[PDB]
Structure formats: structure tokens, C-alpha cells
Amino acid sequence: VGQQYSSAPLRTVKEVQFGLFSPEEVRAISVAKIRFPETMDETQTRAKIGGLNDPRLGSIDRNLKCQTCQEGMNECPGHFGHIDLAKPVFHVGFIAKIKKVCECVCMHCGKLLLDEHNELMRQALAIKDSKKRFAAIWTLCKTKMVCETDVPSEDDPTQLVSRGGCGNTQPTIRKDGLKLVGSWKDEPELRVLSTEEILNIFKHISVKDFTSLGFNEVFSRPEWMILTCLPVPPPPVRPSISFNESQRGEDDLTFKLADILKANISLETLEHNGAPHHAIEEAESLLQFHVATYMDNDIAGQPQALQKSGRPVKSIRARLKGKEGRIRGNLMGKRVDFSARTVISGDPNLELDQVGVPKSIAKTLTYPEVVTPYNIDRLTQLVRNGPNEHPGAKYVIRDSGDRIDLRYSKRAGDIQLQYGWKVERHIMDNDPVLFNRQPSLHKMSMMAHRVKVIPYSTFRLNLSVTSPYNADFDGDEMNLHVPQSEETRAELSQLCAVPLQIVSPQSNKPCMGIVQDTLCGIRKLTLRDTFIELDQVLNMLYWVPDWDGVI
Amino acid sequence: MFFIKDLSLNITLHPSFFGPRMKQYLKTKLLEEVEGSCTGKFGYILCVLDYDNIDIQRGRILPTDGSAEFNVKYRAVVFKPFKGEVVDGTVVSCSQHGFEVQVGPMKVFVTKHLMPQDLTFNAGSNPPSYQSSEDVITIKSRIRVKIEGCISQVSSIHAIGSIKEDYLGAI
Amino acid sequence: AGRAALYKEVYNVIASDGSYVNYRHMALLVDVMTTQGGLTSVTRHGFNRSNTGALMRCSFEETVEILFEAGASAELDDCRGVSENVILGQMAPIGTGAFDVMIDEESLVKYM
Amino acid sequence: IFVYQNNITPSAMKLVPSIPPATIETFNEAALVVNITHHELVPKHIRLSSDEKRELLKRYRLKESQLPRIQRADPVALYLGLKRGEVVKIIRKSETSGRYASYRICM
Amino acid sequence: EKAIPKDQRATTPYMTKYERARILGTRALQISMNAPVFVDLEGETDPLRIAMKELAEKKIPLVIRRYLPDGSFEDWSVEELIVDL
Amino acid sequence: STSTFQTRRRRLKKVEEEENAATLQLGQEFQLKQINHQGEEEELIALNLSEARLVIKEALVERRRAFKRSQKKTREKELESIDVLLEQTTGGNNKDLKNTMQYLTNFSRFRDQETVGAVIQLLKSTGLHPFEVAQLGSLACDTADEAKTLIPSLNNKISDDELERILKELSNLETLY
Amino acid sequence: LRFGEMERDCMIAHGAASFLKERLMEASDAFRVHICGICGLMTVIAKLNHNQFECKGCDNKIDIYQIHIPYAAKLLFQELMAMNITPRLYTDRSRDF
Amino acid sequence: RLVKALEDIMVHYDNTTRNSLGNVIQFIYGEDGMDAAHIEKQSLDTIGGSDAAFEKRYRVDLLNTDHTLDPSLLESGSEILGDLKLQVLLDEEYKQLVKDRKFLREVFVDGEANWPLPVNIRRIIQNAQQTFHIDHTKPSDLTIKDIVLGVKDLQENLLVLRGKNEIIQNAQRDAVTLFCCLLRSRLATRRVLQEYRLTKQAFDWVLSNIEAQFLRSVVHPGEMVGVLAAQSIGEPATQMTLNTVTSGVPRLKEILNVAKNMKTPSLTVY
DNA sequence: CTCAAGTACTTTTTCCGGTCATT
RNA sequence: UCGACCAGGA
DNA sequence: AAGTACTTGAG
Ligand SMILES: Nc1ncnc2c1ncn2[C@@H]1O[C@H](COP(=O)(O)CP(=O)(O)OP(=O)(O)O)[C@@H](O)[C@H]1O
Ligand SMILES: [Mg+2]
Ligand SMILES: [Zn+2]
Ligand SMILES: [Zn+2]
Ligand SMILES: [Zn+2]
């Protein structure tokens, strides 16, 4: 888990503070200045360029060598960089909220179009809920098309009282792709509001006013919805797919950043050099496009920013977007170790709470047991049995913290087990295991079972536990999970065990009874005409494992 | 200057020590960590006071490893130096660069130029001295210094002092 | 009276296919849609819009947008929901983790 | 309480909060023909005193938000002239407990 | 300060299914971690089977901190809690 | 690392505290008003050399008693006697506490608890910071000019004759060798 | 095998908290990061062999903790940051309730 | 959807049902605070039947020579006649049973007397008979006081909510309301003596095993009551499709979506 | 300056070998 | 060692 | 497909 001892105290996350990155912070957080669209290859040399993809950042080639931070690959997380944009550009996500904030504040002095003077406004400001308060204030100020100098006083409407200065008509802002256009006024004046324009207006919005809107003085100022300083994610986020030595291969996100950096370098040259004024707006809108397209590529306005192939390009949004997305596909559900799955078969000679585990499966799955004086002697015979005998073990984990592969280790024959060590041993009869059958629409679809190591390649299971799983033996497969803790074992054996699951709370009745052969035969056996002679009766009685011994 | 400070420490025990003499090991552990320590925040944690009434509290068992964590609240004698703080000390080291003075656990180095002009180096002596028209400063001589500044070099604090100002110097 | 009617209708769609569900479960779903003061749909439009954890709500239907508005309005997540702990890889405050376990020295010396 | 026939001028209806501490309530005749509170599905809602309420939140260790809410516009809330923050104790009949009582804070 | 006094406790005097399961697992893990045992292991070797004897004899030295929705809590000893389950 | 008594958190706010001095601006940690074990307000505790030596002695002496309980089933000479107790109650590797106990024994002005408490009653009636109150009990001064130069916090806080009355009572209170 | 969302729900229903954790962490993703106690980000340039911790930008070389989170959660927060969103992780509380 | 809506809802150590915000959904789980596994359908013989048959079944009149408990039912039967003090006890008893009847007929308007409740009382009496080899020949050792006061006292012990205040003690009183109706129905002085034929010994055993069973039957704080409920409605619906007026999956969709324009709006007018 | 209609957006059960191109 | 299509299982 | 959440447009 992250590997190697750290002196830093171990804590649990108790709060998650969402906010926006301020340019100032993006610069401070950054380890490298990222200025070249070229990843690596310091002209031919197979070493990374001091300008993108480790201009200091994370690491490649499994080199501890990671900007003196050492560690490397499994240990060192990524290290963020930055790229200073030539002009400010909108963040795709906040594009609408920027519009809605412009629709609320005077586009000249930055004062809220509505004041404590308007009675409906006082009521909207009284809203406790940050999002509902924003909503009410917007619906109110969108209407106001003038930054009033004076409004009638609370007493007589005859005498007017002066508020925040300047007149100025407010534009009727509308979206046009990734741009904001106004309509001030026979016939109106229609121009595009610049990213810089919006910004200096937002920078002028007072704390009182913007905190009256969704925003937070410390964590999310309205001005931070516009991008000035772009954060460069490290390689662990955008890994380079190497398919030999010579076969370089970089990620999609690496291409888009290089493209932003390509677009930037052009815009900056046009400005810092002979400004052609109307070519600058072209190179500016291109930067806007790329920064947009990198965070979102499933945008309303048709250009899919296709990679020359015919492929669209995975935006950062697309990465997290549910089922397969980082949230639903990587965090709400994961692929797991200590798992097994094979075809299931019905066994009448199994206990309700047992599960037939094929020796193959028992020999691969492992429970890590701590070398305790209680087990010390048994555990040694398992380690000495090795990974090939059935009751055996696969690894010995030392106090030092280092795995011993009994399959190879020159000392596999030896090993004098010290206490406190762990012995990853083959699953044995009566270990608790979580057994399940998909689709798992029940508390009962997953139950804890005792192991019974048997020959032949299927999971054998008692026929009366068929119903809760809703399993048939026409080629159904089932999943097995092996707990690794002595406390996790208890969890299963004490809450999830099959005997416990017998009476179901969804129906207030038992979810498993006698089925098929045993049910058909129980009727046949019962009825008054059925009589059993001594010879057979005695065999019938012996068959009851708890028979009192009384004929 | 020497303070008494009400402090805490989160020690994490291991199940093997969940025996009758647990408190003893925790108290003994607190001392290991805390006593003789030096942080910038509180300075030198010199001695844990009132061993008898050390508060261990109820320790919480951490999930997936039975190890229990206790916030051991306590009280200790600390030494935290400051700028402008006047100290009495003894000379330890002495070179052409100046002389270092031991002030409690900490050392205060007095630069050649943070001394009066008349007081100059004398290499030709065992031990090497700083000689004045009247005074003589050497490896066992007692001094009074003004702490001009502090630095927190890991598990220590070092200061730069002056004996240039009035009422300061040799004692 | 809304709750009454809502339960009545839910109950009958279940009883429609013979199937029996113990009151409490339908009662709970009905109670949930209701407590808010109105009829809260079991959609992204209804439940997923409440004052619950950002990480918890982004775990269903409107993911990236939920998270974007989290930053833009500086949301603070309690980390009280199951979903949040599951994202954080922390022992959820669920059943077995709905309480804390302590060692008492008083009893540790008493048991020897 | 002002009981109108068909309507009231939007001019006239915007004179209701003009006389505090006192309050005004508009009701249409056709709406009042039937006492909706008498219906099968409508349980007994009961207004809680400042102290009754204060005590409830103490005993259930609740913040005002944590309580299930009744809308101000709610037919029964209108019948009892419920004011923002007032709490009603709803006594209903249970197929499970026999009698179960909930509470609703005003909107 | 949140912490209900012994005399003012109001939660089930009985141990929950979830409580017993976490106590039994915790001690099992601890007995396996090479912790000291407050019971006669009468030929016993499985730490859960040991932890069970300890809870049976009510010689488990742990306390459950039952947290209430307002943060306040009640501390109950495994010695205190009734084990009908 | 050892955790404090004060809990005044810095939510995102990077901005750190200003420099420290004898403008009596110590840390946030070393404020005048601070949090007690009971969660009470309590004034900063600052000790002078000798007030500080006796406190450490008291603790280790009663720790040696606790170490002997558990194990059931004159300046030149005060330095050796102290160094013996250290070998018995301290971890040895506490190089700081040895140098400190030597410094305190060879720099303390008042030997006996009586003379220390008398100095404590004398000064703690001026209403000066525990800093000034301790510094006055630490550095031996003759003039109110001497005192007010070295402890430049004092400057307007006390009368020149008043401070000198104390300085001259602290002299008559100084322990011999 | 994929321990699906459905599979998680059953474990919740059961009350197996410590198990759910073992599945999702120990038996998969489980990773260790060093986070800063001022700006709750995975910054901390933690050279472990030397025992140096530091979060430049906060200048803080002291108020640094270590958390255990699923690697994909590390990844998530890094992706959110790349999108100018600050998912600040704090190991204390403020709000109460 | 049902799962993601209900996830975070669980029972807290205060028997209140709350979400991740600590907002109360149910004040007590399923209005009764009982774990659904520990619930069996049981009849309420106070609901149905003629008003005559009821009086036959439960009325004991120690002041009337015909309607007394026969001295073949209990030992005290002979000296019990005319005991105005004990008739006072038996009057409250019956008066409460009549109250009960009115209440139950109020709750279940159709007269349906078979409802799922905790503690299967039948099985407890059924066992007491086979346990104590109850001979339906000899008279009982029980007193009118033994039965009447015994049941009264059992009730005070069927705790769900513990709270020493009055809001909680009233909430306690309320959650048991129906089970007590069932309790008093089944343990009337007449019914215990004439029907069951219980010895004092058996009665104390029945009384303890009701308390015992009841207590176990209550919900456990931590119970993931939220998820449970979602799968309990979910699984049926998912099976009610997998196997080969708007109703079923489409109407359930209508309901959960709080669909405005619904397909079959109807209005039943009485 | 109200309210009808047109505008756009976002969901769609769970787990579990071959062939293509290109990384 | 990367992920898209197609074909399948309960 | 069915909400939502807006613009766009008539009287
Ligand atoms: N598309 C699908 N999605 C989820 N589960 C499925 C599925 N197809 C089949 N199943 C699972 O398989 C179960 C029934 O399918 P089968 O087993 O193939 C029919 P059978 O039981 O063999 O005979 P039958 O046709 O007489 O019922 C379902 O209840 C379900 O659990
Ligand atoms: Mg099948
Ligand atoms: Zn690194
Ligand atoms: Zn203006
Ligand atoms: Zn930081």
C-alpha cells in the first residue's frame, strides 16, 4: 500500500474541501515550467526533454531518479507542472456560470445589478442555501438592464436615494460557441465580450456581492472560473505507452497539452512580435478551443477535435463519466485479487453452509496467517509442503517485509519461521469465503460459506442454497472471494454465513427450503402407504449424522 | 524563556503490549519520543513533568490492525529562544570567525564583527582567545549575549548573538 | 395524504405480481420521497439534487457536472455517506463501522 | 381570514403584509366547501408550542433542518394557519405499530 | 464536551450483531497479532475460537463507543453488554 | 511530532506569523492567554534559571521514586549529584537535558525553594509578562538602566526607582556559593 | 474478478464494513500518499530515505500527514486538479453537526 | 436508482432512521422498531366475530353465578365468587379488551385480523403445554391477580426505546400499541385458564419467553435499512420480468419518476 | 409584457474468445 | 500490453 | 422517450 515506511502521521480523510485553483496557487504547486510541446528525446537521445513530460514532474524508465524526490514508480505519485497561457481563456465547465454571473453584475463597475433596496432582492438574499440563493438572485438581475445610480427610498417613493454609481446599459448576453456576445441599445450595438474584459469585471466584484452569489472568498472566487495559468498533470495521469525501446507512444492527454502549448506559442509570438491584430483573435480562439477541448470534448458545438485517425480524443470529463468512468468503474466497483470463478455443480453430500473448492483453486488462492506459537508448528509443515502439495503455502513474509517465493527460493527447504511473520498459505477446509452469483440483486446473492477442498474442476454447492443465489447447474459460474484478515473472516462467519441468511427480512419468511428430488421424494416417502422394512430402516438411520443411536 | 507547556502526543501501541503493564510502556514510550526532542514550534522539549499524573486516555483500536492509538496529553519544561532575548552563557568554540557560546541545550555563535572593535583574535594561544584592551575571551570564559536571530537546524536551534551593545560582553 | 396514496400505489404494483414485500421497505421508499415536503422523484432530478455529499451524488447520473459545481460553490463533504468512504477507501460508518472500539486499561489490569 | 368568491385584485392582494405583527389569510369559497381534513388519508396534524418544539429537538438531538418538512402552501398547513418554522405532530395509524407519530417543520 | 455520563446512557443494554462481530474479529486479529490472552486456552489454537472463549467469560478488555447522530457518544464495556443476540 | 494545546486552525490561509522579539511578540504557541489541560484559560508559565532548575529536579526526583515503586515486583557537588539522578531517570541519549541541568546548576541565582518563591512573590506583583518577570529573576542587573536595556520590553511598564527597588531586593535575596 | 457496484451494495446491506474496505483496498487499488495540512493536496515532496517532507508553496515542512486511499482515488483527484478543481482532503473536522 | 436513493439510510443507536445528513426519515424503523426477519403473521381474535362470541370468550364475572370461572379451572374458583375487589381488577381487564377491539377495528377498517407481528405467542403456549405436560383435567394454581397483574407487568418490559424523558417514553408506549393488543387478546384471564389450562409455573415461563423473544426481535443499530429496502422492492421487480389500467414495471416507472402525465388516470368515487 | 411552443440535454441490468490497426 | 469492433455464456 | 430548462415569440 504505497510501499516503504514513512515517519509522517497516518490519518483518515474527514472532510473534502472543494474549490477552484487560483493562478497564483497553480504556479506555487508546480515543479516544472513546461514550455516545449516536445515530450522527451533531447534531440535523438532517449532521455526526457527539460520542457514537457518530466521537465522535473514524475518519472519514466523505472529510474528512482525523479527530480531528487527519489522513490520512483510505485512510491512517487505524480508531480504537477504549469503552463502560463498567452491570454485568459474560459473553463468549459464554468462557461455558463460565467454568463450567469455577467447577467447579475454590472459589466462596467462590477456592482450587483440589484441591491438591498429592492424588496424581492432582500428576500432572495435571505435564502440560506448557496445554490438556491444564486438562482433567485439571477432570475432577478437578468431582467435589470441598467446599473442604477439611484433607487426610491424605503420610506416615501417620492424621494430617491443614491446607491452604487455609474449609469450604463447592460448587454443582453448570449452564447455563440465558446464566446459571449452582448446587445446594448433604433438598431443595437452587438460585440463580443473578451475573456480579459469579463475577468477585470469579475476581479472588481466585491466579496459581499460574490459571496451573495455561490462563491467563497478563500476556496472559489468568480475570477478563478477563467483560466490564466494551466496546471500540467504528471505522467501517472497521462502514461506513455511504450511498445519496445524505439516505439515511443504517448497518451491522448499528452497530445492535447502539446497542442495547447503549440497554440499558445503562436498567440504569444503574434503579441510579443508584429501584432497583425485580426490574426491574434484567430490564434486566441484556437487556444480557447484547445483548453476547452482538453477538459471537455463532447461539447454542444459540433467540432469533436478529432485526432488524425478519425478518433475523437478522450477529454478529462470523458475519463470520469460513469460505468467505466473513474467514479463508477474504478472506485464504486473494482477488479479484485483473492478471487476465483468456475462452473458450479450441485452436491447433496455437502452441508448447507459448505462450498466445494476445486484443489487447483485452493492451491492458488491464499490466506496470510501470522506465525503465532499456536500455529508455528503446523505452519512450518505447510511451508515445508510448498506450493505444489495440497495443504501447503505459497510465500513466507518476513518481519523485514520481503516476500519469499517458495516456488523458487534457494532456502525453500530451510526457513526457520520466526513469530510475527506471515505465511500466505493455500485455502483449507473450513475457511470462511464469500460466494456469489451475478446478477447480485439480494443481500442473499452473496453468502459466507465453509470451504471443503474436493477434486474435479467445479464449485460444488448444497442444493437447498440454490434458491437465494437463483442458480441452476446448466453451465452457471460463480464467484469466490477469500478474506485476508482474522477480523474480516469474523465479519463473514458472524454476519454473512448461510445459516444466518435462512430467514429473509424482505418477505418476513425463509428464503430457502427443500427443493426438487428431495421435495418430490419427501411426499413419496411420507404418504400412509409407504412402509419400510428393517434392513433398509437401519441404513436410513445411520445416514442421519446426529442419530441418537436409538432404533 | 524556559517555559512550562501543556502538550500532547499520539502514540500507536501494538497488540503484543495489550498487557497488565501497558500504561508503563506508554509513559516510557512518550519519554522516548518527546524527552530530549527539539521542534521549531516549541523548541527543546527538555523534561516531562509529573510522571505519576500523565494522562493516557482511552485508546482507540485502528481497523484492519489491532494497534491502538492514544493521545497522551502531558506537561513539559521547554526552552524556545527568541530575537532580542539576552542570555548568559559559556564559550565553547573559538576561531578567527568568532566564538560559539553554550546557552542551555542550544549554542549561540557570536560573529567577529558582532563584537566591539578593540576585541581582536589571538591564534597564538592554547586555547585561542579574543583579546581586548581590558578583557580576554577564551574556551572556558562566561559571556552575556543578545540573540540577534534564530535558525531551526532539524533536531536543534542555533542563534547568532552580539556583545557589541551596552551592558553586554564578558562577566 | 400524499404519502398514504403513494404507498397505496407502490404496494399495489408489488402485490400486482402476487409478490409480497414487508411493509417497512415500501414504507421507507415512500417516507424518503416524502420527508422533503413534497414528491421527490427517484431520478437525477429528485434525490440526487439534495444537500448530500458531493462525492456521493457524483457517484450517480450527473458525475462531472456535480463535481464542477462542487468547486465553483466551494462545497464541503462530511464524508458521512457510504459512497464517500468507498471512494476514499475508508471503513464506512456502516453496520460493523457504526461504532468505535476502545481498550480500557482499568479492565486490562482487572483481567490478570 | 378573508373568504373571497372568485378572485381578489392583484392590487388588493398585495396589501396582506402591510399590517405586522398581525397576519391575513385568503381563502376561496369553492375550496372551503369540503373540509379536506375530514378525508380518509388525512391524519391529525397538531401545532406545537415554542416549548413543545424546543423540547422535541432537544429529545431527538435535532437541528431544525434534520426534521421532515411540511410545505407552507400545504392544504393542512393552510387549514391550521401554519407559519414558517411551526412544527406539527402527525398522529397516524400503523399496520405495524398500531399508532406512529411523525413531525413536520413549516416551509 | 460530547460523552454521555454512565448514569445517563440510553442505548440497548444488549450487544448488537455488528458489535459482537467487530469485538470477535478485533480480538481474533489481536490474539493472532501475538497479544496477551485473558483466558485459559484449554487446548485452543484458533484466535476466533479463543476470542469467543474470552467473550464468553467476558474477559475481553475492550469498550464500544456508540456514536449518536449529533456526535455525542455512550461508552459500553463488553463486560456490560448483554449477549442474547 | 508533539501536538499543542491551542487549536486556532489556518483554513487554506498560507500567511504565517510575524517575527519574534522583546516587542514581546513571541509565538502563537507562547501567547499570554493559553489553553490548560482542563480546557481552561491559564497565563503563560515562564521560569527563570533556578525556578527552572528546581522544577526539573522535583520531577526527576519523584520519577526516581516512581521508578523505585514500579521496581517492587553545594554547586561543585550539586552538579555530580544531579548527573547521577539523570543516569537513573533519563534515557541517557538526552544530551540536551544534561547540558541544560549543568547550565541551570552553574547559572541559577537562588539555591533553595524558599528563596525562589520569595523572588516569585516579589516580581509577580509588578504585572509584567512572565517573560519580563522571569528575565528579571534570571539576569543579574544593578541599574534600572541595565535592566531596561537588556529587557527592553520594560521601558515604560515600570518606574526607574521602582524597578531599582526590586533589583536591590533581588541582590539581598541572592544565594551564596 | 470485478467486484461490481451491485456486489458493493450487498456488502453494505450485510453491514460488513471492514470487509468492503479489504475488498476495495487491500485486495486491489490501495495506495499511500502524503498530503499537506494547509492546502489539502497531494503535493508533499516526501524524500523518505532522508526523512524530508516539505510542501513548497505552503512552505510547510511540518504539518504533513499520510493517508491510505485507492490509487484510482489518487488518480481521480489528480484529474480533477488538471481540470482546475481543488479536491482538498483534510484529516480534521470544522463544521461539527 | 432505488439503491442510490436509499444507500446512506441506517438505524442509529437512538432507534431513529436517518440519512448521511442526519435528517430523520422514520422516527423508528418501519414505525415499530422491529427487525423484519423476526416477524410472523399472527391473528388478532379481538377484531372479528360477533359481539356475543367475544363476551363468551373473554368476559369473567365473579359476581354472577353463571359467568364466573368454574372451580374446575383454578383452585381459588370457589372462594373467588363475589370478590368485588377482584371483579374490579377483571372489569378494567375486560374494559381494556373492549377498548382494544374498538382501536383495532379503527386501524384495520376491513376487519382483517391476520398481521405480521414479532413473538409468535401461539408457539410459546404450544410449547408450554408439551414442556410442562399440561393436563387439561386438573385446576390451575394461578390467581386473578397472578394473571391480570402479570400481563400488565410484562408490557412494561417490552422495551424498544429507552429514553427517561416523556417524548421517548410516549414514543415507547406508541411503538408497542399493536403488539400489546395482541398480547392482551391472547393472555386474557378466561383464555389463559379455560383454553390454555396454564399452571403458574407455565405462565411465568410463557411471560418470560415473550419478553425474551420480543427483545431479540427489535432492529440492530447499524442495520443498513436503506439498501435493504431498495433490494427488497428491486429484486421482485427484476425477477417479475426475467422469467418468461397501467400496472407492473411501467406503472412502477411512472411512480418512481413521479411522472406527471400518467397513462391511466382514474378516480374511484364512493 | 403573459404564456404557448420551439429549443436543446440526458439517461438506458449484472458479472463472464477472435480479429483488426495501432499504440 | 493498447482498446476497438464482432461473436458468444447464465 | 420524458423530463428539464431555457430561449423565442405572439397578443
Ligand atoms: N441478460 C441477463 N442479465 C442478467 N441476468 C441474466 C440474464 N440472462 C440470464 N440471467 C440469469 O439467469 C437466470 C435465468 O436464466 P436461465 O438460467 O438461462 C433459464 P433456466 O432457469 O435454465 O430455465 P427456464 O427457462 O425454465 O427458467 C436469471 O434469473 C438471471 O439471474
Ligand atoms: Mg442457469
Ligand atoms: Zn516524485
Ligand atoms: Zn455600473
Ligand atoms: Zn500545501
Side-chain angles (χ1 to χ4, degrees), chain B residues 2-58:
Chain B
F2 267 87
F3 310 107
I4 277 174
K5 194 80 182 69
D6 279 281
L7 300 171
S8 323
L9 187 93
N10 271 286
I11 343 176
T12 324
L13 243 206
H14 161 87
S16 75
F17 315 106
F18 291 21
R21 264 293 76 197
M22 187 205 241
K23 223 191 200 283
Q24 203 95 97
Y25 188 40
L26 267 115
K27 286 194 185 180
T28 283
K29 210 88 195 156
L30 171 80
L31 299 155
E32 285 163 39
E33 265 91 294
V34 155
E35 213 152 278
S37 143
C38 174
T39 54
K41 209 194 282 289
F42 327 91
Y44 289 92
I45 338 289
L46 296 158
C47 154
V48 191
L49 326 163
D50 193 30
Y51 183 78
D52 339 72
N53 292 99
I54 270 162
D55 169 42
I56 193 161
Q57 281 173 35
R58 238 164 195 149

Side-chain angles (χ1 to χ4, degrees), chain A residues 106 109 147 165-166 168:
Chain A
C106 157
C109 67
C147 174
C166 86
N168 325 321

Side-chain angles (χ1 to χ4, degrees), chain B residues 21-146:
Chain B
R21 264 293 76 197
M22 187 205 241
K23 223 191 200 283
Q24 203 95 97
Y25 188 40
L26 267 115
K27 286 194 185 180
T28 283
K29 210 88 195 156
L30 171 80
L31 299 155
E32 285 163 39
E33 265 91 294
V34 155
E35 213 152 278
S37 143
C38 174
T39 54
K41 209 194 282 289
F42 327 91
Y44 289 92
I45 338 289
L46 296 158
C47 154
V48 191
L49 326 163
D50 193 30
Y51 183 78
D52 339 72
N53 292 99
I54 270 162
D55 169 42
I56 193 161
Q57 281 173 35
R58 238 164 195 149
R60 63 144 304 164
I61 286 117
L62 323 177
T64 47
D65 58 293
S67 315
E69 197 186 1
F70 307 73
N71 180 250
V72 178
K73 167 77 213 321
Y74 67 102
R75 191 191 275 269
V77 155
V78 291
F79 178 90
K80 170 71 202 278
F82 293 100
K83 270 191 213 149
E85 202 237 323
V86 177
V87 292
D88 285 320
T90 318
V91 172
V92 189
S93 344
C94 188
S95 95
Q96 38 108 327
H97 286 301
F99 68 89
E100 213 174 41
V101 153
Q102 193 87 244
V103 194
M106 173 198 63
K107 287 140 170 290
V108 175
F109 174 76
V110 198
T111 289
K112 148 80 229 111
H113 294 301
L114 258 22
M115 296 179 211
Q117 301 103 322
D118 57 295
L119 182 76
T120 58
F121 195 61
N122 175 17
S125 63
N126 205 118
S129 74
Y130 263 104
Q131 203 156 151
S132 173
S133 306
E134 36 176 306
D135 277 344
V136 186
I137 290 156
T138 339
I139 280 80
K140 221 176 177 177
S141 69
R142 204 173 268 209
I143 262 93
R144 182 174 271 184
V145 246
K146 178 213 157 169

Side-chain angles (χ1 to χ4, degrees), chain B residues 1-9 24 31 34-36 41-42 44 46-49 51-52 73-75 77-78 80 82-86 88-90 102-105 142 144 166-168, chain F residues 20-22 26 29-30 34 36-37 42 44-47 49 55-56 62-63 66-67 69-70 90 94 96-97 99-100 103 106-107 131 135 139-140 143 145-146 149-150:
Chain B
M1 161 46 45
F2 267 87
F3 310 107
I4 277 174
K5 194 80 182 69
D6 279 281
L7 300 171
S8 323
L9 187 93
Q24 203 95 97
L31 299 155
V34 155
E35 213 152 278
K41 209 194 282 289
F42 327 91
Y44 289 92
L46 296 158
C47 154
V48 191
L49 326 163
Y51 183 78
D52 339 72
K73 167 77 213 321
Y74 67 102
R75 191 191 275 269
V77 155
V78 291
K80 170 71 202 278
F82 293 100
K83 270 191 213 149
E85 202 237 323
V86 177
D88 285 320
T90 318
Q102 193 87 244
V103 194
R142 204 173 268 209
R144 182 174 271 184
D166 242 346
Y167 294 109
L168 284 166
Chain F
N20 312 160
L26 310 187
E29 223 53 74
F30 304 108
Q34 52 180 90
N36 186 59
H37 61 268
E42 190 193 88
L44 218 200
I45 318 286
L47 335 152
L49 299 173
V55 167
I56 303 175
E62 268 107 47
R63 190 196 291 186
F67 281 10
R69 273 178 242 139
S70 65
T90 340
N94 193 341
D96 312 290
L97 194 56
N99 312 318
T100 304
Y103 171 84
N106 261 285
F107 277 104
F131 201 89
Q135 276 276 263
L139 322 173
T143 12
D145 199 332
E146 189 161 328
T149 289
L150 304 165

